[PDB]
RNA sequence: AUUAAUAGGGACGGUCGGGGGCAUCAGUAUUCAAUUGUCAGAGGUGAAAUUCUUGGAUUUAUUGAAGACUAACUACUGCGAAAGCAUUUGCCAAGGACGUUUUCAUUAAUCAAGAACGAAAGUUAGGGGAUCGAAGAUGAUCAGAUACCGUCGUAGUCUUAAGACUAGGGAUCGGGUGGUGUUUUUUUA
């Protein structure tokens, strides 16, 4: 696939989310999606509208870097927390389907 | 089978320096003899005391006090081992039924004063 | 891609095989290789290339966790949508005495079930306690406070006042 | 050398605890110093306020210091002088089924004062605060002694807070035997 690939380590929570642009190593410095910088109302960030809005700018910078395939690393809070995300996982999957990113090497990085 | 030969084998096995339980189990598994309570009609230590092979303390108190002294080995090694420390207290409760019965049945002396401190001397 | 695999209980494989027909017919169309390895005693699902969305792998992982929670699999694997959250909370690591665990489980069940499941119905959670874990499904907003109240009821305090406070909070939610 | 509740017991070999004491073996999540996909917003989130705010905060391109504990499998299936116990080793007080005609008939029955651990926010502020009170006073140096050995006030000492059912019908539970196959147990009845 001409080595046009990357990895998205999505550390997401119930009311917040973050994106780590990764290679197999720590490379592919593409972008990092913020949690509540897209909309500050303490309920839109929990909704999938603000998460997909931040993912639209994240995928635009990811296309600027040059990573096409995304290896999923779904990270939750874990431990004494709920160990699950809110709507950030569905919004990132919808943004991946809208961007047409290749699905492969998908894993869960939750603790 | 020869009931006197079985009695002679019991006296010889008691004089071998082994326990009477291991003496009789070797007779019951390698010699084919029935029992001391068999038609020979003489008990184990009754033959041994007649032959001068009986022990000083009884057959249920000599090594039992040795296990009482050994039960406090972990208590001396660790005072926090309250399971072993009270097992030695339960080994004082393993002094269980019949010593003061022997004060009236005349088996041990009434001024013997059996205790765990002298059980180390009576262990060997 | 990769795969998600987990072992299940003794009665879980018999329960899942009764609904494994339509589950595998939808998972294979959604690029999930949902099969029950009865020789190894585990259920696995591999992410294939026939998925139109990347949430199929996350939904199959939640469905495998719901199937391995000894709960109703057809009533707990339909959380593939975004506004449908199903999770299991392990409440077995809360008590040590068996009599205290039995007394806490009776308080968690409540009088004839509905005395403690009314707040679960008010929070819209399909709560089902199986052994050391309790699995509930519903909206994420309604289950976040429900799981927090479940963790409060799993504490050493009496859950009778917590259930009364949960009903008071549900009554105050009408406004 | 009548007694054997085989009233009861060192023993006797096969086989055992997530009882328990160490002995190594994994690290699941945190703290600081690291240090960033040079992200200032992230906990909380009756909407709020409120905790931490551009001292980097999900994180990190992981080093150490520490504790820490067994995740879907899974789960009381069990095992506690006792205040309790969930991977992986080598050692041990001891505990464990059972048979014994082999251990002996002689290993006192309940036990309080005498001893062993001795647990469901060892929280809050005034008051008598007196007998005394660790934390440290200070005497003899003993190559070495907060106690070896006199002399003082503070949390303390004690309250203030979180049917006369007349009858039937199938199913249900607890059994058992006719026959039927394995399980129980294949001497541990």
Curated annotation (Swiss-Prot), chain A:
The keyword Acyltransferase does not apply. GO terms for molecular function: RNA binding; small ribosomal subunit rRNA binding; structural constituent of ribosome. Its main location: cytoplasm. The gene is RPS14B. Keywords: Cytoplasm, Nucleus, Ribonucleoprotein, Ribosomal protein, Ribosome biogenesis, rRNA processing. The chain holds residues 11 to 121 of 138 of the full protein. Belongs to the universal ribosomal protein uS11 family. This is Small ribosomal subunit protein uS11B. Present with 3370 molecules/cell in log phase SD medium. The lineage of its organism: Eukaryota, Fungi, Dikarya, Ascomycota, Saccharomycotina.
From Swiss-Prot, chain B:
It is found in: Cytoplasm. Its main location: cytoplasm. It comes from the Eukaryota. The modification Phosphoserine is found at residue 5. There is a cross-link at residues 12, 16 (Glycyl lysine isopeptide (Lys-Gly) (interchain with G-Cter in ubiquitin)). One of its GO terms (molecular function) is small ribosomal subunit rRNA binding. GO terms for cellular component: 90S preribosome; cytoplasm; cytosol; cytosolic small ribosomal subunit; nucleolus. Belongs to the universal ribosomal protein uS15 family. Component of the ribosome, a large ribonucleoprotein complex responsible for the synthesis of proteins in the cell. The small ribosomal subunit (SSU) binds messenger RNAs (mRNAs) and translates the encoded message by selecting cognate aminoacyl-transfer RNA (tRNA) molecules. The large subunit (LSU) contains the ribosomal catalytic site termed the peptidyl transferase center (PTC), which catalyzes the formation of peptide bonds, thereby polymerizing the amino acids delivered by tRNAs into a polypeptide chain. This is Small ribosomal subunit protein uS15.
UniProtKB/Swiss-Prot annotation, chain C:
GO terms for cellular component: 90S preribosome; nucleolus; nucleoplasm; preribosome, small subunit precursor; small-subunit processome. Signal peptide: none annotated. GO terms for biological process: endonucleolytic cleavage in ITS1 to separate SSU-rRNA from 5.8S rRNA and LSU-rRNA from tricistronic rRNA transcript (SSU-rRNA, 5.8S rRNA, LSU-rRNA); maturation of SSU-rRNA; ribosomal small subunit biogenesis; rRNA processing. It is found in: Nucleus, Nucleolus. Keywords: Nucleus, Ribonucleoprotein, Ribosome biogenesis, RNA-binding, rRNA processing. The keyword RNA-binding applies. Residues 85-155 form the KH domain. GO terms for molecular function: RNA binding. The keyword Ion transport does not apply. Present with 4340 molecules/cell in log phase SD medium. Required for 40S ribosome biogenesis. Involved in nucleolar processing of pre-18S ribosomal RNA and ribosome assembly. Essential for vegetative growth. This is KRR1 small subunit processome component. It comes from Saccharomyces cerevisiae (strain ATCC 204508 / S288c) (Baker's yeast). The chain holds residues 38 to 212 of 316 of the full protein.
